Design a protein around this motif. Structure first.
Motif, mmCIF file in Angstrom:
data_model
loop_
_atom_site.group_PDB
_atom_site.id
_atom_site.type_symbol
_atom_site.label_atom_id
_atom_site.label_comp_id
_atom_site.label_asym_id
_atom_site.label_seq_id
_atom_site.Cartn_x
_atom_site.Cartn_y
_atom_site.Cartn_z
ATOM 1 N N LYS B 24 62.579 62.697 -4.465
ATOM 2 C CA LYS B 24 61.168 62.562 -4.792
ATOM 3 C C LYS B 24 60.361 62.126 -3.582
ATOM 4 O O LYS B 24 60.698 61.149 -2.918
ATOM 5 C CB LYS B 24 60.976 61.612 -5.962
ATOM 6 C CG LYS B 24 61.511 62.209 -7.255
ATOM 7 C CD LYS B 24 61.273 61.323 -8.438
ATOM 8 C CE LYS B 24 61.859 61.944 -9.689
ATOM 9 N NZ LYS B 24 61.577 61.106 -10.880
ATOM 10 N N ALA B 25 59.296 62.871 -3.300
ATOM 11 C CA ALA B 25 58.431 62.601 -2.160
ATOM 12 C C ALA B 25 57.232 61.785 -2.603
ATOM 13 O O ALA B 25 56.718 61.964 -3.709
ATOM 14 C CB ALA B 25 57.968 63.898 -1.540
ATOM 15 N N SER B 26 56.776 60.884 -1.742
ATOM 16 C CA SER B 26 55.680 59.998 -2.098
ATOM 17 C C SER B 26 54.322 60.710 -2.098
ATOM 18 O O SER B 26 53.364 60.222 -2.706
ATOM 19 C CB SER B 26 55.660 58.795 -1.159
ATOM 20 O OG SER B 26 55.374 59.186 0.171
ATOM 21 N N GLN B 27 54.262 61.856 -1.420
ATOM 22 C CA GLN B 27 53.092 62.725 -1.399
ATOM 23 C C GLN B 27 53.600 64.161 -1.394
ATOM 24 O O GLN B 27 54.754 64.405 -1.056
ATOM 25 C CB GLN B 27 52.248 62.470 -0.146
ATOM 26 C CG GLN B 27 51.724 61.053 -0.054
ATOM 27 C CD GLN B 27 51.041 60.774 1.268
ATOM 28 O OE1 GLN B 27 51.448 61.282 2.309
ATOM 29 N NE2 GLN B 27 50.003 59.951 1.234
ATOM 30 N N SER B 28 52.737 65.115 -1.739
ATOM 31 C CA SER B 28 53.146 66.519 -1.824
ATOM 32 C C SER B 28 53.695 67.088 -0.516
ATOM 33 O O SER B 28 53.145 66.846 0.559
ATOM 34 C CB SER B 28 51.969 67.379 -2.289
ATOM 35 O OG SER B 28 52.356 68.742 -2.361
ATOM 36 N N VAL B 29 54.761 67.874 -0.621
ATOM 37 C CA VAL B 29 55.285 68.591 0.540
ATOM 38 C C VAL B 29 54.942 70.081 0.457
ATOM 39 O O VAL B 29 55.503 70.904 1.197
ATOM 40 C CB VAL B 29 56.799 68.381 0.705
ATOM 41 C CG1 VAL B 29 57.113 66.890 0.815
ATOM 42 C CG2 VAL B 29 57.564 68.987 -0.440
ATOM 43 N N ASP B 30 54.003 70.418 -0.427
ATOM 44 C CA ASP B 30 53.549 71.802 -0.587
ATOM 45 C C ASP B 30 52.455 72.170 0.400
ATOM 46 O O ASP B 30 51.602 71.348 0.737
ATOM 47 C CB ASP B 30 52.992 72.045 -1.994
ATOM 48 C CG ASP B 30 54.066 72.059 -3.069
ATOM 49 O OD1 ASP B 30 55.264 72.013 -2.733
ATOM 50 O OD2 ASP B 30 53.695 72.114 -4.262
ATOM 51 N N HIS B 31 52.464 73.426 0.830
ATOM 52 C CA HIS B 31 51.336 73.979 1.569
ATOM 53 C C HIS B 31 51.322 75.494 1.436
ATOM 54 O O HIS B 31 52.336 76.151 1.648
ATOM 55 C CB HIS B 31 51.393 73.585 3.044
ATOM 56 C CG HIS B 31 50.098 73.794 3.767
ATOM 57 N ND1 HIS B 31 49.049 72.904 3.684
ATOM 58 C CD2 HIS B 31 49.676 74.799 4.572
ATOM 59 C CE1 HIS B 31 48.039 73.347 4.412
ATOM 60 N NE2 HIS B 31 48.395 74.493 4.962
ATOM 61 N N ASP B 32 50.164 76.035 1.070
ATOM 62 C CA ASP B 32 49.958 77.479 1.039
ATOM 63 C C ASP B 32 51.000 78.204 0.183
ATOM 64 O O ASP B 32 51.453 79.295 0.530
ATOM 65 C CB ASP B 32 49.982 78.033 2.465
ATOM 66 C CG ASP B 32 48.910 79.078 2.702
ATOM 67 O OD1 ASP B 32 48.683 79.917 1.805
ATOM 68 O OD2 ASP B 32 48.289 79.055 3.787
ATOM 69 N N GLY B 33 51.381 77.589 -0.932
ATOM 70 C CA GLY B 33 52.286 78.214 -1.878
ATOM 71 C C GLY B 33 53.766 77.972 -1.622
ATOM 72 O O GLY B 33 54.597 78.381 -2.433
ATOM 73 N N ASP B 34 54.099 77.322 -0.508
ATOM 74 C CA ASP B 34 55.491 77.003 -0.191
ATOM 75 C C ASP B 34 55.718 75.500 -0.207
ATOM 76 O O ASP B 34 54.782 74.722 -0.035
ATOM 77 C CB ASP B 34 55.884 77.566 1.174
ATOM 78 C CG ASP B 34 55.753 79.074 1.238
ATOM 79 O OD1 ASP B 34 56.571 79.770 0.603
ATOM 80 O OD2 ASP B 34 54.833 79.556 1.925
ATOM 81 N N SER B 35 56.971 75.108 -0.418
ATOM 82 C CA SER B 35 57.355 73.704 -0.483
ATOM 83 C C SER B 35 58.340 73.413 0.636
ATOM 84 O O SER B 35 59.448 73.938 0.636
ATOM 85 C CB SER B 35 58.010 73.399 -1.835
ATOM 86 O OG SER B 35 57.150 73.729 -2.913
#
Lengths: 14, 111, 114
Positions: B24-35
């Motif tokens: 579990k990440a403390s903030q999102s690791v998503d960008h532009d549809g990818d993780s």
């Protein structure tokens, strides 16, 4: 092929 | 910085069963549809070995027994079935935001 | 295939500096960042930074900004990590990686004497 997406390359030298 | 928390810290599993490791990440690791979450396996005295990249992509040379799922802040590595050679420590790593960061590791043993 | 060959283990004195190397074969280092990682058994894995050998660009994690200097030489396909003013907390295994972060060197052990 992990080259492109195993790191985020959208702005890796900003 | 993004803090990665793995669950459990240690896991003892029976040969032939399924096992899941959570990151579990403390903030999102998503960008532009990818993780941008990777999973690594490490055995003592050896370098980390990439298993999964961008959450769900199986790395060349890695058995299909390993798969990844998730997006945003919640990710899982699944091993199906567990085999003897899987005894190792597993790490998640995010590469979405600088500095890249790693989870604290999950040590998998066979019962 | 791609191989990252890291330099030999080093015993280092407090206050001294040490320069580790990562010699790449089967891959043109101009083609990708080289990343450096630190590993200690208690504190685990940490990313030090990345260097672009094609232009010398570097990005560090803030905790390594005044400790580590990354350089590279395309003429020798080698990346270097210089650690300065060493202290006990610098004792660790140091790894280099490239091809995104898919291919890793074997690690260099740095030990710090008392």
């Amino acid at each position: 092929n992990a080259y492109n997406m195993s790191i985020r390359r959208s702005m890796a030298e900003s | 910085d993004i803090v990665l928390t793995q669950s459990p810290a240690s896991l003892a599993v029976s040969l032939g069963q399924r096992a899941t490791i959570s990151c579990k990440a403390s903030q999102s690791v998503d960008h532009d549809g990818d993780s941008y979450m990777n999973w690594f396996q490490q055995k003592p005295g050896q370098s980390p070995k990439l298993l999964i990249y961008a959450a769900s992509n199986l790395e060349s040379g890695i058995p299909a027994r390993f798969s990844g799922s998730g997006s945003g802040t919640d990710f899982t590595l699944n091993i199906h079935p567990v085999e003897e050679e899987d005894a190792a420590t597993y790490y998640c790593q995010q590469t979405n935001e600088d500095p890249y960061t790693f989870g604290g590791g999950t040590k998998l043993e066979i019962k | 295939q791609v191989q990252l060959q890291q330099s030999g283990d080093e015993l280092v004195k407090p206050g001294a500096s040490v320069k580790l190397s990562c010699t790449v074969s089967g891959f043109n280092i101009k083609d990708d960042f080289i990343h450096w990682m630190k590993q200690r058994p208690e504190q685990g894995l940490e990313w030090i930074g990345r260097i672009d050998p094609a232009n010398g660009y570097t990005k560090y994690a803030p905790k390594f900004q005044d400790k580590a200097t990354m350089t590279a030489d395309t003429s020798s396909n080698t990346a270097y990590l210089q650690l300065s003013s060493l202290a006990s907390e610098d004792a660790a295994v140091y790894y280099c990686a490239t091809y995104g972060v898919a291919y890793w060197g074997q690690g260099t052990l740095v030990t710090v004497s008392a």
